[PDB]
């Protein structure tokens, strides 16, 4: 059971402008997150939003629904990685307001190339291949803009699963600070 | 049914700053526990929180979401093992505020090395192996800091499943006291 406070705990956090991305990214999750971001902007267009990320990633298009909504709205969206931000999860971590992207000290960040599939006629396979290669170019370009790393370096570093510590994620430019405890 | 008090029973306990970790550790459970910890700190940054643990463990990254949140927040988090704390469950037990880690007398604590898997090309298997070995080094280092045992001893003692009584867990440095009735 999800506990109640007197709100379910997540709804209580949303009241303080905290959004929890604590699962695989699919269309349902993206629709909820997008709706939450729009709601929070409508309530107050100036106050920061906080996006907590513990996610192994998921759908790239679902991820881009969230990404584009973050960049569109007026409030700054802070990102905090707890546990793990992998694949599209690490992309969203990097998408937070500059200066306000964080990871907790033992959090894991993983970057890699997009995954997919293609079945059928040669021509169909060609179309699918061209599509996923364009998708990868788009991700790499944006990640270049967000991190300061070259497109060529992003390409090389995502060829296989690449696991980073919080400190390495900071050095890479995916986050701004490791959030150390008082 | 989960019974009601006039709150569901867990929500009633949360009102008194008690969090129940009574299952496998996955992302959902971690997200809930983290949210509860943050809520309780916001309500009162000075009063102790109590984390009751009966868990066979689970995801290491989910476990670290909880661990890092415990260390980050201002309140002390007491840990109490009832039944069993195994694997990442025993790691969280050891993560409680020093002096405030407890086990009930018949509670079981188990420590062991992390589990996982890898399929594909040699290079992919290499990456997966390096990752889980780094994860183990990280767990062992922190457990060394939390228990006072050397890294070398932790490595040897977690090579296989290692079951401890509450009293043995205290001697090991995983808990501070056996909670006697």
């Amino acid at each position: 059971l999800i506990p109640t406070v007197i709100y379910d705990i997540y709804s209580r956090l949303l009241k303080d402008r905290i959004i929890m991305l604590g699962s695989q990214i699919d269309d349902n999750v993206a629709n909820s997150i997008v709706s939450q971001l729009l709601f929070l902007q409508a309530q107050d267009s100036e106050k920061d939003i906080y996006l907590y990320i513990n996610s192994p990633g998921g759908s790239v298009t679902a991820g881009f629904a969230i990404y584009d909504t973050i960049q569109h709205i007026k409030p700054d969206v802070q990102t905090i990685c707890i546990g793990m931000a992998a694949s599209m999860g690490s992309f969203l971590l990097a998408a937070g307001a500059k200066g306000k992207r964080f990871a907790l000290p033992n959090a894991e960040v993983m970057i890699h190339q997009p995954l997919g599939g293609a079945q059928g006629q040669a021509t169909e396979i060609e179309i699918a291949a061209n599509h996923i290669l364009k998708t990868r170019e788009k991700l790499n370009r944006i990640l270049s803009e967000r991190t300061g790393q070259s497109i060529e370096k992003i390409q090389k570093d995502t060829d296989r699963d690449n696991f980073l510590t919080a400190e390495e994620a900071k050095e890479y430019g995916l986050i701004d600070e490791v959030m150390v405890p008082e | 049914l989960i019974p009601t008090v006039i709150y569901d029973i867990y929500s009633r306990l949360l009102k008194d700053r008690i969090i129940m970790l009574g299952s496998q550790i996955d992302d959902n459970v971690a997200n809930s526990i983290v949210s509860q910890l943050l809520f309780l700190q916001a309500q009162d940054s000075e009063k102790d929180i109590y984390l009751y643990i009966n868990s066979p463990g689970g995801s290491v990254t989910a476990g670290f979401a909880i661990y890092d949140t415990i260390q980050h927040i201002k309140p002390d988090v007491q840990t109490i093992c009832i039944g069993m704390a195994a694997s990442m469950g025993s790691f969280l037990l050891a993560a409680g505020a020093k002096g405030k880690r407890f086990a009930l007398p018949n509670a079981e604590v188990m420590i062991h090395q992390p589990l996982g898997g890898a399929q594909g090309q040699a290079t992919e298997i290499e990456i997966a192996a390096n990752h889980i070995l780094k994860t183990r080094e990280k767990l062992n280092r922190i457990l060394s800091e939390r228990t006072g045992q050397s890294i070398e001893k932790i490595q040897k003692d977690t090579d296989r499943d290692n079951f401890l009584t509450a009293e043995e867990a205290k001697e090991y440095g995983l808990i501070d006291e056996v909670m006697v009735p």
Binding site: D48, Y50, Y52, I80, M179 | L38, H72
Partner: peptide, 6 residues
């Protein structure tokens, strides 16, 4: 997680 988030 405040300061500074909230």
């Amino acid at each position: 997680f405040s300061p500074x988030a909230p």
